[PDB]
Structure formats: C-alpha cells, structure tokens
Scaffold this active site. Structure first.
Site, PDB file in Angstrom:
ATOM      1  N   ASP A 191      37.678  17.430  17.185  1.00 55.21           N
ATOM      2  CA  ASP A 191      37.285  16.304  18.018  1.00 55.21           C
ATOM      3  C   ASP A 191      36.714  15.199  17.139  1.00 55.21           C
ATOM      4  O   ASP A 191      36.632  15.351  15.925  1.00 55.21           O
ATOM      5  CB  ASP A 191      36.211  16.767  19.000  1.00 55.21           C
ATOM      6  CG  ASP A 191      34.996  17.346  18.288  1.00 55.21           C
ATOM      7  OD1 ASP A 191      34.120  16.568  17.857  1.00 55.21           O
ATOM      8  OD2 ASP A 191      34.923  18.585  18.139  1.00 55.21           O
TER       9      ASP A 191
ATOM     10  N   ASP B  70      33.618  14.126  17.368  1.00 59.10           N
ATOM     11  CA  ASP B  70      32.180  14.226  17.578  1.00 59.10           C
ATOM     12  C   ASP B  70      31.791  13.262  18.705  1.00 59.10           C
ATOM     13  O   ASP B  70      32.309  13.380  19.817  1.00 59.10           O
ATOM     14  CB  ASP B  70      31.417  13.899  16.294  1.00 59.10           C
ATOM     15  CG  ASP B  70      29.955  14.318  16.369  1.00 59.10           C
ATOM     16  OD1 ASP B  70      29.688  15.440  16.856  1.00 59.10           O
ATOM     17  OD2 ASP B  70      29.076  13.532  15.938  1.00 59.10           O
TER      18      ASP B  70
HETATM   19  C1  LIG Z   1      31.871  26.591  19.824  1.00 59.12           C
HETATM   20  S1  LIG Z   1      31.665  24.847  19.354  1.00 59.12           S
HETATM   21  C2  LIG Z   1      30.399  24.981  18.034  1.00 59.12           C
HETATM   22  C3  LIG Z   1      30.917  25.582  16.731  1.00 59.12           C
HETATM   23  O1  LIG Z   1      32.069  24.789  16.293  1.00 59.12           O
HETATM   24  C4  LIG Z   1      31.813  23.973  15.110  1.00 59.12           C
HETATM   25  N1  LIG Z   1      31.937  22.423  15.546  1.00 59.12           N
HETATM   26  C5  LIG Z   1      33.060  21.849  16.140  1.00 59.12           C
HETATM   27  C6  LIG Z   1      32.946  20.561  16.420  1.00 59.12           C
HETATM   28  C7  LIG Z   1      31.668  20.244  15.990  1.00 59.12           C
HETATM   29  C8  LIG Z   1      30.892  19.038  15.990  1.00 59.12           C
HETATM   30  N2  LIG Z   1      31.362  17.876  16.477  1.00 59.12           N
HETATM   31  N3  LIG Z   1      29.606  19.115  15.457  1.00 59.12           N
HETATM   32  C9  LIG Z   1      29.124  20.280  14.968  1.00 59.12           C
HETATM   33  N4  LIG Z   1      29.767  21.469  14.919  1.00 59.12           N
HETATM   34  C10 LIG Z   1      31.035  21.377  15.450  1.00 59.12           C
HETATM   35  C11 LIG Z   1      30.405  24.463  14.627  1.00 59.12           C
HETATM   36  O2  LIG Z   1      30.469  24.919  13.232  1.00 59.12           O
HETATM   37  C12 LIG Z   1      29.886  25.612  15.604  1.00 59.12           C
HETATM   38  O3  LIG Z   1      29.872  26.941  14.946  1.00 59.12           O
END
Ligand SMILES: CSC[C@H]1O[C@@H](n2ccc3c(N)ncnc32)[C@H](O)[C@@H]1O
Ligand SMILES: CSC[C@H]1O[C@@H](n2ccc3c(N)ncnc32)[C@H](O)[C@@H]1O
Ligand SMILES: CSC[C@H]1O[C@@H](n2ccc3c(N)ncnc32)[C@H](O)[C@@H]1O
EC number: 2.4.2.28
Lengths: 262, 262, 262
Positions: free
Chosen positions: B206, B208
């Site tokens: 994504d 963020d």
């Molecule tokens: C189940 S979503 C959260 C996990 O996905 C990862 N993730 C994915 C997108 C994202 C984001 N925008 N910010 C932080 N971690 C993220 C991270 O490492 C965490 O273990």
C-alpha cells in the site's frame, strides 16, 4: 570552594591524571556507580574521577548506571562535572582527533531512565544543557594549548550498542547533529537535575559512515587521549580560580523549581 | 557449502516452497524461535524456513523473538538468510505489488533488544546492513522473471503495532525513507552480529497514508505472494552455485572484532 | 444517545465543570485509572470527567496509565472523549494562551504501551487520529466565543519528564510539528483502538525553547484555564444535539477489522 567530578569515557579515563589519589567505593539509592570513585587533586583543586564504563570497560552504553554515577558525584560534593567522550564526526570540518566542546544534544535513546524523580515529578529545562562558563574555559584553554577545537556542536546520542546505518547517519546530519555517541544522554540530563555544572569534551574518532569500527575508534583514541588529559589538567586549575557562587545558585534554583510536589 | 535460512513474513511464509521438508522445534539461549524450523531443499540447496509471526501468525512485530530466530538459524548452520516482508510504500514509483530489494534502514523501534551481547560488549558496524552479493542475485533474478523490482530502498521500521499517522508518514519521507514496516530492525542487526549474509525481499502492499489497513495489506499480499515465492525458488539455486568463502570470512571477522572483551 | 468522556490535563482538570457530580472509583484489566471517574452533566448531556495526572497531579506523563483511563471511559459507556492538554508552541503564530484543535501527532515516546492488544494482534490505522466531526464543533464553538483558536496542528509528544533541548525543538519544527507535549501519545492511539471519537483541546503555554519552565507553564495555564472550560461547556451541548449513529459505526468497524485473530 569547588570540587570537579570527572567522568572518563572510552580510552579517556586514565586515573594518572590525579595526584594523591584514594579509591572509594560507594552506593546510591539507584545502585552502585560504574566503578569506585577516585578522589585526588589537580594542583590545589579537589577532583573525583569516575570511569564511565568501569576500569575494565565492560559496561555497555545502554547499561551504564547514569543515575548512580551522577548521584554519587553529587553526594561527594562535586560542584562541576567535566566528562570526556569518544564520538563520530558528522561534519567534514570536524576531523578525527578534533575536540568538540558540545553545547546541544539530540536524544535518540529509548531504554534509559532519564530522571531521578521516577516517583514528586521533575520537569527540568534543557534549553542550555551544558555549563556555559565551563565551556568557555575549556575553549580558551584548548586555544592556549594550540589544539584543534570546535567551540560548539550538537551531539546526537543513539541507544546502541550497534553503530548507525548510513541512512540514519545522513538523516542525523539533516536534523542538525554534528557528532554522534552513545552516552551524552541521559548523563547531561541527570546532571542538570542534580544542579551540577556539566560540560563535555567530545573527541571525534571517525566520520561515522556518511568505515566506523571498534578498532578504528580505539586506535584514534589511543593516539589522541593525551589531548583530553592536557586540556583537563590545564582547565581545572583555572576553574578553581574563578567565582561560581551565583552560577551554582541559579542551577540549584532551576532544579528545585522544576519539581512538582504532591 | 551454503545453507539458506528463510524467514517468511506476513502472508509470505508458505512452507510448500521447500521439498523434502522436516519439522524441527528448537530452543536457544534467548528462548524459543517464532515457530518450528522447517528443513528442506530448493533444488540441491539446503534451506531452513521459519515463519516470523508463527504459522498461526499470532506474534506481533514488537513481540517477535528476533534474537532466538537469528540464533536458531545460525546454530542450524545457515550461511545466508533471505527474508520476505510486507511494507507500505513511501514513494510514488513504488507501487503496491512491487518488490523492493532494500539496502538501508532507519530505526524507529523503541522496545526491542538489538544485540546478542546483552551482557562482553558488541558494537557492530551498520554501514552496509544487507548482503550486497545476495542483493545482486535477487535483483538480476527478478529481472529474469520480468518482475517490477526496485534495486534499492531505505526501510524505516516502526515499533507498532499501530500504523503511522500522516504526519509521521510525511516526516519519514523527508528523512529519506522509501518503504515502511515493523520487522526489519532488529532482525537485520542481529543477523550482522551473527556474521550471516542477510538480504530482504520487501513487498509493497500500500501507500501507507501520505488508506492503509490490515485488510488492504492482507489482500495485496495474497495477490502478490506468488512473486516472492518464484523469486526465492529461482534465486536460491543461483546462490548455491556461487563462491562465498571470502564473503563469509569478512562477515565473520567484522562480527568478531566488534566485541569488547572484559 | 451520547456520553462525553473528559480527560483533564495539567491545570485544566476542574471538576466544577459538571453538575450533579458523583465520584466513582473503578478498576480495569490494565489497572486503576489515574483517579476516580466523576459522573455528571453539562446541560442534559451525560459526561465522565477524569483527571489525567490525578486530582493531586502527582503522576508523571510517562507513568500515566493511558490504557486504564481509556478502558475505564469506554466501559462507562463513553462515545466521545474530549481532552485538554498544556503544550509548548513551535510556531510564532501560535501564541501562549492560544487554543489549538490538533489534527495530527508525531510520536517521540519510547517507554509506553500503545495498545490494548498486548497479547490477538491489533494494527489500528492512524491516518486521521482525531475525530473530525468533534473537531469541527470545537472550532466553530471557539469562533462563537471569540477565542483565538487554530483549526489544526501537529502535536509531537515527547517521553519526558525533561523538556526538549533547543536542538530537539528546532528539529521538531523541521519535521512539521506545531506544538509539543508529553501526553497525546498513546492516549489518542488507544482511544482509536477502543472505537472512541477522540479530540484534543491543546492550550499553548509557552514557545518551548526554539524559556519554558514549570512555573511559566503553570502560570499561563492558570490565566487561561477559563477558556478551555468555556469551550467544553459550550461545545458539549452541541454534540448532544447532533447525530453520530454512522460516525460511531465506522469507528467500531475500523477497530474490529484491525484485529488479527489467532
Ligand atoms: C498485518 S499488517 C501489519 C504487518 O505488515 C507490515 N506492514 C504493511 C504495510 C505497512 C505500513 N504501511 N506500515 C507499517 N507496517 C506495514 C508490518 O511489518 C506488520 O508486521
Ligand atoms: C568502543 S566504540 C563505541 C563507544 O564509542 C563511542 N562512539 C565512537 C564513535 C561513534 C560513532 N560513530 N557512533 C556512535 N558512538 C560512537 C560511543 O559513545 C560508545 O560508548
Ligand atoms: C507541568 S509542565 C509539564 C507538563 O505540561 C505539558 N507541556 C507544556 C509545555 C510543554 C513543552 N514546551 N514541552 C513539553 N511538554 C510541555 C506536558 O504534557 C507535561 O505533562
């Protein structure tokens, strides 16, 4: 009268700097200091030396008992505290071997108690973290000794024990940091809370990574330790000849009025 | 000979990737790994698979035992460690589904042990945190597979479990971060301390919030997991055909000389 | 129906704001709240007041049990939570005494649990941390009262208890922060996880140090507390006359779907 506490950093903690030395192990409400306090003198000035990482240098930055160290020095009657610290340079003009009389800090630590009031509540001001009068004497003295010395600098203190990544190193430069170590915070913070005039002699040992290694750092320190020793030996007698009655009074007042009573 | 450790991230931990698999629960001086080690092979290369969050994916980023995981892989004889990780994109050019072979990191974690030397003292260098030779093969292989792949990128690792605020997201972009996750640090740091060649396959899920949600992330991962699987299956045989006698020797030396003996 | 939880900050926690008050000490799975809950009303709207630092103001920012406070308010049936907080200004246009209806935050805390799911796993979105509908009413109401009020602002929350150094203060300005305190995070984060509409009334008490002291802060607060009280008294009846059936439904859904089940 004044009594100078001296916290020796990595490779910059030689006890030979003091005459008529006497070892003294103490205890504090926060545990034992890094090592025994070394009472002695530089000319006619009473000093108290304390190796930050222990005379065996076995305590890592994150595990140093900063609270006990500052508390112990305060209890022994120290009015001032001048320390030495190895650091990496984040500026081209700050070359390995250069001394930096830091005047600001940027905290990047995460697991460190930073107050004596871990429960009243103490909210101590940090605008001017380092004793300006002491910094002034250190700068003038470095000049008299003909040493390469920077009159100011912002130290970013990382948690460690690992060194920074290149991305962090470049990032810190953009935040305005000039040098980097693992021990300035919370040592400087607790000293302020204790009402102690605190100053730091930072010794650049490398250009971090914006290449830095233990051997590189220890090597540069060995080659430059003499500078910090000479600066302290020459600076301290000068402090014992100046008046601090008002300077110490203001630190005492700022510390006291920063405590929220129940 | 080489043995590839593989740490599967969220939705990117399918054990079917290995042939002739054998489960193996182990223990370490730092506790038990996230789950049982899965011994197996990709062609003629010995591999060890480990699900970062457990095959049930119940362990949160902050609670993952990174120390045990890396220690366990090292003990089993792993020379290399290639991991997968879901992350958010902080750059327009890095589109959801894109693979990013990260080469730097920015630490934003706060409550995580980052060293095996929690007490000698280990100050391990972090200039080049990811194994360049392994990253090279991953990049060339992604190219052979025709996959959208970025040859470098700076991963900022937040503590979590919460996602970032928009202000933090924009702030990270200004610090030079390109993608964001909750697991790169200290996994990468501990791997370096263990003398292991570590590389990471980051999968952007994504943009963020500079919109990100669990469902959004899990959805994009499901649709793109096949890419990471194909990349690993194709990359690994290539590593087992290259020479690393000197590469591993340098990592061993850097790790050893980064330890301060009492 | 709605029930407004009110978390009183430093010098902004006067219980006289509520009529027909009844004290009520409670307990939660995370321990006891900062102090007893004060049930009462503002016109015909049910409210629950809770002093963040305790009616004796003895709990420091780092030690406040944010989890218990938010959990307790949620359990009592609160649909909304409007809080007050003293902060330092990082912008010239934000003058001491000014009210800032913050809309973003930047986390600088390090030792604070930020989730109720300390173990499933909850990854809650933080793009829009503050309830927009409530912020809208606060802004319009401040306008009706003729008060100096900023319609948005980014709050950087430091760990404390110490204030920031000048280098940190300047650094925060470059990250885009507008005001600074020690309590917004994780209060705002946990409120989001609880599915509660959360909004904050920040009261600038000084210009930090880019001069800030306990006495300075307490002084400005004493002189300006009346503003926050008037704003709350006038705002709340307006919330009890608006429809939130859908607004609360979306918060409930976002919170629920942010939990990873074993
Ligand atoms: C189940 S979503 C959260 C996990 O996905 C990862 N993730 C994915 C997108 C994202 C984001 N925008 N910010 C932080 N971690 C993220 C991270 O490492 C965490 O273990
Ligand atoms: C034995 S090397 C590590 C120690 O030296 C200091 N040092 C020296 C260079 C350097 C750097 N580039 N980054 C962080 N700390 C550093 C730190 O305060 C730590 O206690
Ligand atoms: C009693 S002063 C400290 C308290 O006031 C708030 N405050 C006020 C000014 C200020 C500042 N410049 N930086 C950080 N916190 C501040 C903090 O949230 C803390 O709970």
């Amino acid at each position: 009268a004044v009594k100078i506490g001296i916290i020796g950093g990595t490779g910059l903690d030689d006890p030979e700097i003091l005459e008529g030395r006497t070892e003294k192990y103490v205890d504090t409400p926060f545990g034992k200091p890094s090592d025994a306090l070394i009472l002695g003198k530089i000319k006619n000035v009473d000093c108290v030396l304390l190796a930050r990482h222990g005379r065996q240098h076995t305590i890592m930055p994150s595990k140093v008992n900063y609270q006990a160290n500052i508390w112990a020095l305060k209890e022994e009657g120290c009015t001032h505290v001048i320390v030495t610290t190895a650091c990496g340079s984040l500026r081209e003009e700050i070359q390995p071997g250069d001394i930096v009389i830091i005047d600001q800090f940027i905290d990047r630590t995460t697991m460190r108690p930073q107050s004596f009031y871990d429960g009243g509540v103490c909210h101590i001001p940090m605008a001017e973290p380092f004793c300006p009068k002491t910094r002034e004497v250190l700068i003038e003295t470095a000049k008299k000794l003909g040493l390469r010395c920077h009159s100011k600098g912002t130290m970013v203190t990382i948690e460690g024990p690992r060194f920074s990544s290149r991305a962090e190193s470049f990032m810190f430069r953009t935040w305005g940091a000039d040098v980097i170590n693992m021990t300035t915070v919370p040592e400087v913070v607790l000293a302020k809370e204790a009402g102690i005039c605190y100053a730091s002699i930072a010794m650049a040992t490398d250009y971090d990574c914006w290449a830095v290694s233990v051997d590189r750092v220890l090597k540069t320190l060995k080659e430059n330790a003499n500078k910090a020793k000479s600066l302290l030996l020459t600076t301290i007698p000068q402090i014992g000849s100046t008046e601090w009655s008002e300077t110490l009074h203001n630190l005492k007042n700022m510390a006291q009025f920063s405590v929220l009573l129940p």
